[PDB]
RNA sequence: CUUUAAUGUUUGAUGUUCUAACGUUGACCCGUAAUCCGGGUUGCGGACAGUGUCUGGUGGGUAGUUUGACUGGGGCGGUCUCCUCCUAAAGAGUAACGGAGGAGCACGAAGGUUGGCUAAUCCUGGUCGGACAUCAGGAGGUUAGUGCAAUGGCAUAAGCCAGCUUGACUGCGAGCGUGACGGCGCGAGCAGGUGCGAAAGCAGGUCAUAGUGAUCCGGUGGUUCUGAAUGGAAGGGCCAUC
RNA sequence: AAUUCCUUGUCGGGUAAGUUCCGACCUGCACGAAUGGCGUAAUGAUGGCCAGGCUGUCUCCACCCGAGACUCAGUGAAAUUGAACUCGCUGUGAAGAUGCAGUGUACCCGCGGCAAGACGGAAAGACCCCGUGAACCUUUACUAUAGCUUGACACUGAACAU
RNA sequence: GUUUAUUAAAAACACAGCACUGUGCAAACACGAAAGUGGACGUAUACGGUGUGACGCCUGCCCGGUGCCGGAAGGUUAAUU
RNA sequence: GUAACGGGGCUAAACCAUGCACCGAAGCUGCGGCAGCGACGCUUAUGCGUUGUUGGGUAGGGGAGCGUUCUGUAAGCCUG
RNA sequence: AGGACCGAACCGACUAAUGUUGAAAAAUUAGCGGAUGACUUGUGGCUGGGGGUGAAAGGCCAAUCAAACCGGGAGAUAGCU
RNA sequence: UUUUGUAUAAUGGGUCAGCGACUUAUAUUCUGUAGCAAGGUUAACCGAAUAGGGGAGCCGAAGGGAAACCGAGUCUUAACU
RNA sequence: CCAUAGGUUAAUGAGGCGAACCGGGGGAACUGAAACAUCUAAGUACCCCGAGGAAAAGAAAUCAACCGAGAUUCCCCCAG
């Protein structure tokens, strides 16, 4: 009765900190809103995370919530 | 005797000018209306052989 | 499953429909939507829900 | 072909098209080969004794592949642009 | 030309009768000093029977074969695709007949947009009132809610309400992701046309992650692409869908 | 019970002692009437049980007579066999050692005997599994089919009446 | 009486008897693409098949299923047209 | 069959600490030598006074060779 | 009279021992069964391989049988050793 | 030899000698090497026969497109940043 | 009754063997499809009839494409 699972997602960050992302890059694979959507940021359907700009990303909490978003900085 | 093209696969497959190979997309055939009109439009035009696969459609076409 | 495919039928004469589903039991009228008919290239009513 | 009994790749994927056979009676002619034939005409019969299309090539088309540095009259033929032009700045006369 | 009686008359069914086909493993004659055969005469049946071609049924009487894999041996049982969590060792991924639960949909609104709103639970008091309906305040602060599992999310709400609507648009697509491949997924922006909104703008389906099936063979509609002398057509292709 | 799992069922007989046997009981796991039921004289190289007689079957062997075995002469095989200067023990180790380790024992070579071991010889395990192996066999597995059967047409005609 | 020649002789096979069923003779049935041949130079007190298996007492209820026999208004139904 | 240090035997030849010496391998070094892969001055179809490094190996890939019979070179060369 | 009785030839093969590179690819020794019958035996003949024949054991069909032997398809195929 | 692993009590071999297994043909592709080179090369056949002739053909110098068709561009789309 | 079957004789010819090739009449399965039935193997193997030095085939009721070719057979291409 114990025997099925799912086949795994492949989720989580694909571009770490200060890493040179082209406008499109996936940024994070997500449920949810975990991360935030910042400057030069999309939010996809899926909630992924993906840049609009070429640049480099840039992690960091902001707002009331504490809550954390991604942005790409022009280099 | 002369290599024997294997026929199914001359219908499913044409050469290209730098050696590759283009081929129809699968999953266009039927059940599409479950599917959504922007995968379907993607699988409209042809792609080409990936590299792992060029070995068996060459070997299956000879006289490409 | 109960829901079944309909197609819905452009009223400009092009021939092109679109394709969807519908719950027959329930709201047994006929859907008719304004969709873009990619032949004389404008927005158009469509009707059809067998 | 055979892939271990997956599915292969030459029928998991869709056959298309069809074959004309009028493309099996239709030739390109290179502007290379217009100083091939003796007259100075090209016509499809006397590109025929020149041995650059097939005996049963029945519609010939000249295209911009090489050069032409002659006076050459192609009749009965179908010209591209670039080769109508090529053929025109070396005293050329398309005749359809 | 509407109608409607008849027969030489065409073929339909049934019934009766016939004989000349056909049959005869009845008698008799000859070939022939032959229980075969044939012919002959005769009787008996007789358009039957019987056989051929076609056809439905029956048909282990006979034939060719199939009758799965995983598996702490095999078999019985269970399982086989997909989604969620844990195992999983703080990137991804990661096995067991490991531990636990779901899916094989639903929705023309439960979608788009504009505008607006913010729960559960308990407390106090109050007509029928119970411990719990509705009302008012208060504390509470999401301990609720999410069309359906679980997880991650959600107040700028993605949650509740209403108005207008069809972007559940068509063609494309920088670039990424994930896959051995097939493929799957995310996607700004462009063209065309639309909706909402005063406007900025948002909208290429639904909070997301399951809700599915390659190719072949066909079907339907569109499309004068092709059209085996030629004009057509058939069929094929291409597009959409089954 | 040629059928009973439970089961050596219960009781009784027979025996000092009886899972068998006989008889009866019924609680027939799971008899039963021509795939016969119940009996049944006779018959049986049939199965089971009892007794008399008999005995080396046995207690428990002993002796004897002969054919071999042993010795001489003559003839003269065989299976097997990687090579062998081919010991015990304890341990180790593809996990049960003549062959490794340690130790112990042991002068070299026969002959008659015995079979504990050489996982001895013999047969590419016959059980078990696997192979998208095979063969026969079964059937309301699939697909066919001889045969049987149905009708249409042909061989096959004439009339009469409705 | 028979049997696994060469590990089984038996409770197995057969058996007389019994029954069921088929068979009207160019018999059923069987061997045979066929002709023919057996059945049988027999003819239902016969022949073939099946089952039971001397003899004795007997052989009970069940025809829903499967077959077999029969019946036939209706429905379904092939070639053909 | 001692058979629970491998044995002998050990009261250290055990154990703990504190040290200095030795043994100990196909490891390292030393001498000589072969080969591979690079990189180097003279100079050149390069090979070296040179230089550096490498060189266990199944499946398996790559490279270069040995020998055998026959054909040509060969009516030649060796050989009673 | 008798598929009657005892028992030799004859036909068979229940037990035991021997032998198991045997004297023997199924026997020998002692015993055992039938022994006027559904007996046994000689000569010749017929039946042929999905066929025969079978008092039925899948028994037998030239020491070979759940499809004989010989030749051919044929170097079947062998994801196995 | 086979294996995770074999002195293994796992397989094979008594010994010697001799024989005994990646071939051949045609197609195709890659490499090397040679020839010619935007051209290369001929097949059958003829025969002045390993010559020479034979260029029928094949490949290559252009692709895109399902195709018509267009063509250094083409397809896609009404049209493409 | 005619006749015909049937009978006797004469003359002419055949009969059977043989390697392959040839034409015709019948016709497998293993196998391959990674199972298997369509399909494959293959009109192969095999059986049978008949012929000849070769046999068969053969002088367009053929192709072609609006230009034309001009019986059959075999070879190379067309083309996997
Ligand atoms: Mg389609
Ligand atoms: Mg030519
Ligand atoms: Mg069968
Ligand atoms: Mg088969
Ligand atoms: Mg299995
Ligand atoms: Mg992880
Ligand atoms: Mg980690
Ligand atoms: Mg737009
Ligand atoms: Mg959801
Ligand atoms: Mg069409
Ligand atoms: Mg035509
Ligand atoms: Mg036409
Ligand atoms: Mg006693
Ligand atoms: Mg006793
Ligand atoms: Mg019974
Ligand atoms: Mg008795
Ligand atoms: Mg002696
Ligand atoms: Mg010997
Ligand atoms: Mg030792
Ligand atoms: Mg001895
Ligand atoms: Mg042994
Ligand atoms: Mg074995
Ligand atoms: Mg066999
Ligand atoms: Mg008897
Ligand atoms: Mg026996
Ligand atoms: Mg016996
Ligand atoms: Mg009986
Ligand atoms: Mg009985
Ligand atoms: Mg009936
Ligand atoms: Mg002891
Ligand atoms: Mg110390
Ligand atoms: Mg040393
Ligand atoms: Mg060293
Ligand atoms: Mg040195
Ligand atoms: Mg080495
Ligand atoms: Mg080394
Ligand atoms: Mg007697
Ligand atoms: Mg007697
Ligand atoms: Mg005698
Ligand atoms: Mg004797
Ligand atoms: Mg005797
Ligand atoms: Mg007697
Ligand atoms: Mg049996
Ligand atoms: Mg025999
Ligand atoms: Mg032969
Ligand atoms: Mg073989
Ligand atoms: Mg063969
Ligand atoms: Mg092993
Ligand atoms: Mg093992
Ligand atoms: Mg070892
Ligand atoms: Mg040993
Ligand atoms: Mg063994
Ligand atoms: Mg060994
Ligand atoms: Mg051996
Ligand atoms: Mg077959
Ligand atoms: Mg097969
Ligand atoms: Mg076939």
Redesign the interface.
Known sequence: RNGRDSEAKRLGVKRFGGESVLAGSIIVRQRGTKFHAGANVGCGRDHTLFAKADGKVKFEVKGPKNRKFISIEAE | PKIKTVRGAAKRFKKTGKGGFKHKHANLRHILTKKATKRKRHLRPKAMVSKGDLGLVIACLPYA | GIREKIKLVSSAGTGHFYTTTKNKRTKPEKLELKKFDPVVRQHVIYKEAK | ?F?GGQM??????????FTSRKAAITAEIRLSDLAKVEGGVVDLNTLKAANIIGIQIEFAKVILAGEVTTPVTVRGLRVTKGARAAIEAAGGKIEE
Do not use: H, I, Q
């Not at chain 4, 292969?8 to 098209?17: C, D, H």
């Open positions: 072909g892939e292969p790749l030459y029928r998991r994927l869709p056959k298309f098209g």
